[PDB]
RNA sequence: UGACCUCAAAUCAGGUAGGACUACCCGCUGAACUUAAGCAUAUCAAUAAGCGGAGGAAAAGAAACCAACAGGGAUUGCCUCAGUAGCGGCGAGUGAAGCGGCAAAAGCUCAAAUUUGAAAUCUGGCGUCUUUGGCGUCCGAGUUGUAAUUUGAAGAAGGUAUCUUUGGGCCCGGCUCUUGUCUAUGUUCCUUGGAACAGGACGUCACAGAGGGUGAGAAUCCCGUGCGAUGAGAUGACCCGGGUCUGUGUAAAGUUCCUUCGACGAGUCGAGUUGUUUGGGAAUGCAGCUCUAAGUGGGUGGUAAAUUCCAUCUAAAGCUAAAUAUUGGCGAGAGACCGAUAGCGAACAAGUACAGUGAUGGAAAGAUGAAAAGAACUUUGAAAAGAGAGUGAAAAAGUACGUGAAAUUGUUGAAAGGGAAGGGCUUGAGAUCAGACUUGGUAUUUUGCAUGCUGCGGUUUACCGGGCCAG
RNA sequence: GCCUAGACCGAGGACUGCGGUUUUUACCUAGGAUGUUGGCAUAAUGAUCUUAAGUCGCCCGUCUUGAAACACGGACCAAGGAGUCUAACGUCUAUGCGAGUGUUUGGGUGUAAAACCCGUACGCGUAAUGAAAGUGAACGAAGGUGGGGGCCCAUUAGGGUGCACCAUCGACCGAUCCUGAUGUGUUCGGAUGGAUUUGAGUAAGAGCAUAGCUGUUGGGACCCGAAAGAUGGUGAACUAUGCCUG
RNA sequence: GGCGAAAGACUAAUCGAACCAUCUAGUAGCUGGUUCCUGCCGAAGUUUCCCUCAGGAUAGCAGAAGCUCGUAUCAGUUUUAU
RNA sequence: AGCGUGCUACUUAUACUUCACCGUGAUUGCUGUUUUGACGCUUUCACGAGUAGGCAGGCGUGGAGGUCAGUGACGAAGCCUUUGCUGUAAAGCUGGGUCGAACGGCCUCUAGUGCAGAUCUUGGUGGUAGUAGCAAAUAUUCAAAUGAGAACUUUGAAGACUGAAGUGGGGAAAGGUUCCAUGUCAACAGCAGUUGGACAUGGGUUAGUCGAUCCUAAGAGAUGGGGAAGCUCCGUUUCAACGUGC
């Protein structure tokens, strides 16, 4: 708010003894504003309680390594079909994930050709989902340049840009990203894992250089892919194993019998 | 987040957690460190002994660059050796050829003598060493070279 | 006003500080416009580099003796050694510092070699130089082309030479000598006149 | 999406620029598409409407109505056709104000300046 | 009778100053509330108010610097130093700088020198030309010193070996700015609707699916958007890329070594004292007063003094872009901002109406409809109005205009009511609501469908089984 | 021991149990209600609202030992209306990396305040102690004793090893006090050995960063509230006094 | 500050120090208020110091987070002995 | 139906006993049947007062990221309502009516986020209540006209009063069109109104001689000067070379 908002008055309290509350009041006469309360957060025309300041904290720091941890985790989640379906993508007609397309897709120049490529690879149902999901936003946000809301489509990740970005520029809901610069705002929209990512073969090949491997060192300085604290992520299969079941005691009933 | 604060939970209860008798006021007790010798003495004596008074001599225009002398112990001295040649150095080192460790070029002022060294000759370059640190270095067959 | 086991704070906010709060919302905008200024300046003077060549000097004080950094300008002696007049040198991208002198030889030699490396790669155009030759050149970054490099710290293997006197004893003796230099000089002098006046 | 930094996506700025447009700027706003026949006779798809053009109404209660424009009531952002009148219970008729975006021009009023405009826009006038 | 000096006059010729703005800037002057749980030093604060002065930035600025190192090297800003050294009723509080990393980088000009074989200099008048000016001429300024030459980093005068480098103007481009013009694809079909911009079908364009408008959610109806293309006008000793004409280069500038020299700012430095200020503490700066220098002199080296060294600069004269600031002005773009008691005091003929002698104080007030189509006409009435009618999708939209809450009120209906009323619990009465003959199954008949009898509502007593309430 | 009258309830939901009768791999009264009959389904039943009756019930908020108070605020209704943000911190929790840690002052890049990338310094940590000059952490398996989860060997027990941590006695570094070797710019040096002394120390590092609740301090500081003080201005149209002219 | 045949009178309904705007949201150990539900736990008016006595700091009482363990040795109690 | 005393039965607390249900704490078991919920299911036992205060789990509001290819002009949101249902509750959902353009659920984020009070703020509306009251200035009445309408307008007749220090006739200050004619009654004239200083439309102020203009008064105040950092202060012919002379 403005620094002087609610404080452009010369009001003084009348004190006590005049049968009115001790709030400051506008002086003078002849207007209906005269004698009215002022300066208070309870008063009409006063200033709000704790007026907002610009030196509030707006940006937040995140450790760089933690941010890279999250980027890697989202990239990994993009290859889990249950997570992509839970995320909300129409990927039931894509045979396997990840979806990798030949590099000829990096060179398309017309939106018609790019849309045909999306149709061919089975990623167009999700574009149509985006088209159909357009609605007017609820609330006063539509008075502030946020008038319409829609879904997020597939994310296209490339290695060389030969017009793929401008070709897919106008397709609604489809985002493009270089493999070199992948950020969390595209990989996990709304903090929900499982973006629908379409890789080119160039980007898919460059992934191993970008994030390294047991044989390849990351281009990122001093960066290694993180290590899970568990080695086998299927615990039921671990429990029902010869190693464990050969030492456990026999199991009781699922439910105790009421004996009294 | 304001929604997880207790202000949102105190809504509806009269005093906002401040008590009905105490009546949260502006500044009971004073502002800042008021009354440190009069009515806050019981706190300063208990938790901050030594607070009042002068000790020692002043030092006009103290330049902290003069007193720069970071320490490195002997148990950490072999980390200053290049990592990839550490194992090779630890094996073949002898009085005819021992690794040279310039502690000054790594940002250290004085070599202190905590810990034990590998039984390996070394040539240590430092601006300063402690008495015990230099005794330990010569005990493994090394030497200290003073630099400036 | 003073309660519990807490650190005692020095928060200097008793003046009208809220009138002098400077929030750097324009950090990104300043970065972008700084880059635009840099681009315009580079494009104006191409292929001539945007930076003047700077010398390499020792950082002052006992804390930063080890480090070596970029100086302001080559001394008049350093330019004298490579035969460049300072007035001329300022016109071919070599910075000049009339204030610095060379007491030592190491810094002087390093900067002379730096000047020679620069002068070898310098191609000075003229009226006869045509647009094609100038077009065949690329605007380099002088600072990156001639980076300031720290001298290599001592490593490797060397023969071990053990003096009889320890380094600790050497430092103790140096401290003691410095501490008592004045009093010993006074004592020795007054003894000298005592034994040179009563023995006359 | 808009790319130019000189173009504003503000709703309030857009609406202020429309309702406070001058009569000269309102001339371009009140453009009407040409009929399919003229769009090949001239090879131009739309023109600022003019007084003596003939238009066919394509939207609204008066769809299918034909007539020559009478006035480009620029203040009201509208045009009035010859016989698109509503009668009051008084018995007097008032013109019905149609927006030029809801008509098609079936015949142009062609003079020296219009033809240059048609030639300018890549079309053929004469 | 004449010069000179000093001082005047003129509606003399030609110029210049003032005032306005306020966000930032440069100075002066200068509080108190407040904190110290009292209060006087202190703090607030070297701040507010007051006065003077500017610019697009200002200021500062090319060391009488920092240091104490192997030394750095004009100024400014950031990060850090550092809540540190220090100051402080050593209380409350307060509080820098050097170094280092970076942004930006740019350097210079006078006085003090005999041109002395030539005041070589400059304002003005007059004349002329091709006019931000050139050329000629005449007065005037000026020797109590205007030009050329040098600025300490040097430099000068001689001698020296040769070498190296080079002035101006016009004409078109480029770059910067402003601005004009030009550009893809459905208004196809059906349903609802007053209106299709809605739903469904089939599509099309897309470097354009930002935004706005149009009678409801419009990429494809319009303007734009995206992509660019092409004109015009500016602007730039102090940007370059070219032509073209003049280049008066026996010129100027630099470069090596030698010799001799090498002018360097005074009521100033410095000292005492007083006051203020500072982190500056036997005194950080500033100012007043008194005293008042020197020529390897002078300043600084954060504890006063003397003795001896060392290091480092060279004051008392001056100019200078960029990096930095910006609640003002001009022009733009945005937002997890407000949404008409909010947001600026002001979404409206708002600093308006109005008050006050005056300084000053200072509101309330948005929304019919798509379109006034804003109710013709008849009737009762003095009229306002009413009743009909009419317009409209709607008059349960009539300008006392979207929706139209509560307080409060009218009418109707119900009910209760001996100096209050209202509440809980329990039941009665009245009203309202709910529920199993279940998606009930078993054979059954006709009514009904496009169809070649088949899913299955329909009916009544049988049979089986169920629901609920009771004995 | 036996007979006998009445009231309230029926949780659970295949089996598993303890018993009993055994005529029996059966049955039971023994780890919680079933059987049968009638009626109704246009209703018996249930709920709510309004009202009557019976009984109980003082007007809320507040300060207070004590409020229905003859204590204060409150005629009524709508809308607005009060623990916020920040700098620096303490504890705890989560996350990343870990003797390190922190990209975001800055540069590179960009689909342009985003995202992505880079690195020098610097901060905190890794060493303390002293006013300072200064000095600067292994006798030992980084010590001994008593416990100590867990693990190993046993076979109740018992034995071995025993991380964290607790109690305790020591060792090491700095300060203070004492002692004073070889020596020496003869006044310096300070080996060695000690001391009911002392430190926010060592004794196989635990931190750094971000976020969150809570608490603290300074800020208007949960909201409203003085009597005052200061700075710069406006008033002698009322009134006070003088003068001029009536 | 004025003015006062003096009442602390009068100085624009304002006078034992006018009015206007600002500093200023001045400070207040004092008064008043402080906005949803349920669950679980649940006080104190006492100690010492304070120009302290209508206030603080301190200890106590309370909550929360837990952590090391798993009957070890503990108790607003009795007995015996002293 | 008192007092002292004894006995028998009987009455009833939110206490005790048994049972049901809720929650909290502890506790049993559950992966070769873990099976798409192990932050779950499950067995058993005990317990339940509460201000100040603490903590936990939830309900609701404005806005943000994601998702429901969610609802909606065949009616969104809002509002009213014995239409009900769900939840201990905060609340959520629904039937009917009104209405006309947007709006919700779920996973997260965020905050100017929840009112009965503050002699709270702004706006609105009551009871009081058709009540207090509309009583100073001697005093009005008859008729006619106008008019829808006359205590109040006009005219006539009468009766009165101010009684020349006036309720007369002019002016200064102040006002500013109130002046005059025509028309007119929504508001105003605290009854009324055909009337008006109201409302609407027009018209109207004539100077050589009346004033101002000129003179000087108490005083104000430039200049030359002199102070003051300065805003400005003093001074009024003043330490002045003072004529826009005749």
Task: Tell me what the structure shows.
This is part of a larger assembly, with chains A (260 residues), B (148 residues), C (200 residues) and D (126 residues). Chain A is 26% helix and 9% strand. Chain A is built from 9 helices and 8 strands. Chain A has helices at residues 64-77, 81-87, 111-120, 124-132, 164-167, 184-187, 201-211, 235-239, 242-245; strands at residues 12-13, 24-25, 99-101, 135-136, 148-149, 155-158, 175-178, 197-200. In chain A, strands 3-8-6-7 form a 4-stranded parallel beta sheet. In chain A, strands 1-2 form a two-stranded antiparallel sheet. The two termini of chain B are 56 Å apart. Chain B has a 3-stranded parallel beta sheet. In chain B, strands 2-4-6 form a 3-stranded parallel beta sheet, covered by helices on one side. Chain B is an alpha/beta fold and 148 residues long. Chain C is mostly helical. Chain C contains 7 helices and 3 strands, in the order αββαααααβα. A two-stranded antiparallel ribbon of chain C has the order 1-2. Chain D has 4 helices and 7 strands, in the order H-H-E-H-E-E-E-E-E-E-H. Chain D is globular. Chains in contact: A-C, A-D, B-C. Chains B and C meet through helix 1, strand 2, strand 4, strand 5 and helix 3 of B and strand 3 and helix 7 of C. Strand 2 of chain B pairs antiparallel with strand 3 (157-158) of chain C. Chain A binds 4 RNA strands through helix 1, helix 3, helix 4, strand 4 and helix 5. Chain C: Belongs to the eukaryotic ribosomal protein eL13 family. Chain C: One of its GO terms (biological process) is translation. Chain C: It is found in: Cytoplasm.
Work out the largest interface and the residue count of each chain.
B-C, 49 and 28 residues
Task: Find the count of extended strands of chain D (DSSP E, 2+ residues).
Answer: 7
Largest sheet of chain A: 4 strands, parallel
Distance between the termini of chain A: 70 Å
Beta-strand fraction estimate of chain D: 25-35%
Net shape of chain D:
globular
The helix content of chain A, as a percent range, equals 25-40%
Q: Got a strand count of chain A?
A: 8
Quickly give the structural class of chain A.
alpha/beta
Strand order of the largest sheet of chain A: 3-8-6-7
Across the major sheet of chain D, the strand order is 6-5-4-3-7
What is the helix fraction of residues of chain D, given as a range?
10-25%
Oligomer: part of a larger assembly
């Amino acid at each position: 708010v403005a620094e002087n908002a609610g404080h452009q008055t010369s009001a003084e309290s009348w004190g006590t003894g005049r049968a009115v509350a001790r709030i400051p009041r506008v002086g003078g006469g002849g207007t209906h504003r005269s004698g009215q309360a002022a300066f208070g957060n309870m008063c009409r025309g006063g200033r709000m309680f704790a007026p907002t300041k610009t030196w509030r904290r707006w940006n937040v720091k995140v450790n760089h390594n933690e941010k890279r941890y999250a980027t890697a985790s989202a990239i990994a989640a993009s290859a889990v079909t249950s997570l992509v379906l839970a995320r909300g993508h129409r990927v039931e007609q894509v045979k396997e994930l990840p979806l990798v397309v030949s590099n000829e897709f990096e060179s398309v120049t017309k939106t018609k050709d790019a849309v045909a490529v999306l149709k061919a690879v089975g990623a167009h149902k999700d574009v149509v989902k985006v088209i159909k999901s357009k609605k007017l936003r609820a609330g006063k946000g539509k008075l502030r340049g946020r008038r319409f809301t829609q879904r997020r489509g597939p994310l296209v990740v490339y290695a060389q840009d030969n017009g793929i970005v401008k070709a897919l520029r106008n397709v609604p809901g489809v985002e493009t990203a270089s493999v070199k610069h992948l950020g969390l705002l595209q990989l996990a929209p709304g903090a929900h894992l499982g973006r629908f990512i379409i890789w080119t073969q160039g980007a898919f090949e460059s992934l191993d250089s970008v994030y390294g491997s047991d044989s390849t060192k990351s281009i990122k300085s001093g960066y290694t892919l993180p290590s899970n604290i568990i080695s086998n992520t299927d615990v039921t299969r671990l429990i029902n194993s010869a190693e464990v079941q050969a030492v456990v005691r026999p199991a009781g009933e699922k439910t105790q019998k009421k004996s009294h | 987040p304001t929604r997880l604060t207790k202000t949102r939970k105190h809504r509806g209860n009269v005093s906002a957690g401040k008590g009905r008798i105490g009546k949260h006021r502006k500044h009971p007790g004073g502002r800042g460190k008021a009354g440190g010798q009069h009515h806050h003495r019981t706190n300063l004596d208990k938790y901050h002994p030594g607070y009042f008074g002068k000790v020692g001599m002043r030092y006009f225009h103290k330049q902290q660059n003069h007193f720069w002398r970071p320490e490195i112990n002997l148990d950490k001295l072999w980390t200053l050796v290049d990592s990839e040649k550490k194992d090779e150095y630890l094996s073949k080192s002898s009085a005819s050829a021992a690794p040279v460790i310039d502690t000054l070029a790594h940002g250290y002022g004085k070599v202190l003598g905590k810990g034990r060294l590998p039984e390996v000759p070394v040539i240590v370059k430092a601006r300063f060493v402690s008495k015990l640190a230099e005794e330990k270095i010569r005990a493994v067959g090394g030497v200290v070279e003073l630099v400036a | 006003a003073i309660s519990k086991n807490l650190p005692l704070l020095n928060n200097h906010f008793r003046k009208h500080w809220q009138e002098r709060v400077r929030v750097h919302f324009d950090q990104a905008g300043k970065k972008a416009s700084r880059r635009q200024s840099r681009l315009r300046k580079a494009a104006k003077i191409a292929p001539r580099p945007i930076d003047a060549l700077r010398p390499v000097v020792r950082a002052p004080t006992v804390k930063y003796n080890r480090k070596v950094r970029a100086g302001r300008g080559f001394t008049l002696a350093e330019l004298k050694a490579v035969g460049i007049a300072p007035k001329y040198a300022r016109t071919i991208g070599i910075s000049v510092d009339h204030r610095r002198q060379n007491k030592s030889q190491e810094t002087f030699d390093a900067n002379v070699a730096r000047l020679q490396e620069y002068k070898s790669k310098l191609v000075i155009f003229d009226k006869k130089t045509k647009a094609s030759e100038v077009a065949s050149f690329e605007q380099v970054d002088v600072s990156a082309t001639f980076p300031v490099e720290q001298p290599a710290p001592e490593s490797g293997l060397r023969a071990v030479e053990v003096p009889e006197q320890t380094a600790y004893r050497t430092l103790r003796l140096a401290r003691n000598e410095k501490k008592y230099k004045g009093i010993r000089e006074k004592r020795a002098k007054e003894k000298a006149e005592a034994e040179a006046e009563k023995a006359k | 999406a808009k790319i130019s930094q000189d173009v504003s996506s503000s709703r309030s700025k857009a609406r202020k620029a429309y309702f406070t447009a001058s009569s000269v700027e309102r001339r371009v706003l009140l453009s009407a598409p040409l009929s399919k026949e003229l769009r090949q006779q001239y090879n131009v798809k739309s023109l600022p409407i003019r007084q003596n053009d003939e238009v066919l109404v394509v939207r609204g209660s008066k769809k299918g109505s034909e007539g020559k424009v009478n006035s480009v009531y620029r203040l009201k952002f509208a045009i009035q056709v010859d016989k698109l009148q509503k009668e009051k219970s008084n018995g007097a008729s008032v013109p019905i104000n149609i927006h030029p975006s809801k008509v098609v021009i079936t015949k142009l009023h062609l003079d020296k300046d219009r033809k240059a405009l048609i030639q300018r826009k890549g079309g053929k006038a004469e």
